Amino acid sequence: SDLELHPPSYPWSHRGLLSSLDHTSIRRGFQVYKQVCSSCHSMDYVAYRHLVGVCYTEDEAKALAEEVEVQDGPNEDGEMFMRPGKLSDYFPKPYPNPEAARAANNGALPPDLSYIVRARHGGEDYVFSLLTGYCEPPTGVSLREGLYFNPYFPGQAIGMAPPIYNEVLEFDDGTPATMSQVAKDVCTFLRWAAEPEHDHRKRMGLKMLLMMGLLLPLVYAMKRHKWSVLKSRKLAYRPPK
């Protein structure tokens, strides 16, 4: 407790002012979400239609939604049935309550992962450092072992076991699925989940700066034109005698 360590600056393909997300790295990172995180983590604000622009086709995302059963509201009996899964439906919920989340995870609540990048200082750098930074405790420090050592988590005792050295995932393009690379892809995706506007924001950003680079000197030249009359005026005082 009390003492803290703060994350380093990793050079993401999306860090710099005009730099978009790697969408191939978004694609891989969804797969990390589906395979690993979704069993414990809610993502209440991303639906299957959101992927269609970004990392999949319309047909692909329909098929990924088809993998899960949903629950739809009733027919004539007043019933609640289960449903093959669509595109309008949100990412599926592991738990009905927060209390059910706490009951599975020995008292600790796994937080929703929709905004987790924007909800922590450091953003993706913190999450990467949390994932790749699991180590042995130092001498002096004993845990519960219900709680686990991480130097990046405040207090040092995280209720999350390392979810990461497990070498998982169907890969399609088929890049190597190392602990470093699996963390790189998930963080790239979790940025997108926090900020879908990221790519549009920066395209607009370029368009702004280019326009302002035109418009600022031109409006300046307009104000200089009108003000010329005054800035070059000569006064003379000519009193009698």
Binding site: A221, S228, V229, R233, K234, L235, R238, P239, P240
Partner: protein, 75 residues
């Protein structure tokens, strides 16, 4: 509400003016401009700068002290 014609009394002042179409929008813009900003900086530095440096010194001390307070060395 104040209006032209009713402001004040002025006697014996000639103003000479040129059209903006007759003249430069940026006359001697760097060659006269940068000497002027240099002269303006000199005129004000001794009034503006010394409070902010005194903030910076209290900033850098205060951050250094707090960081170094959050450490032991014997128990």
């Amino acid at each position: 509400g104040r209006q032209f014609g009713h402001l004040t009394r002025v006697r014996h002042v000639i103003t000479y003016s040129l059209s903006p179409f007759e003249q430069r929008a940026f006359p001697h813009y760097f060659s006269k401009g940068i000497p002027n900003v240099l002269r303006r900086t000199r005129a004000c530095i001794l009034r503006v700068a010394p409070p902010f440096v005194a903030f910076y010194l209290v900033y850098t001390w205060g951050t250094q002290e707090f960081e170094k307070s959050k450490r032991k060395n014997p128990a």
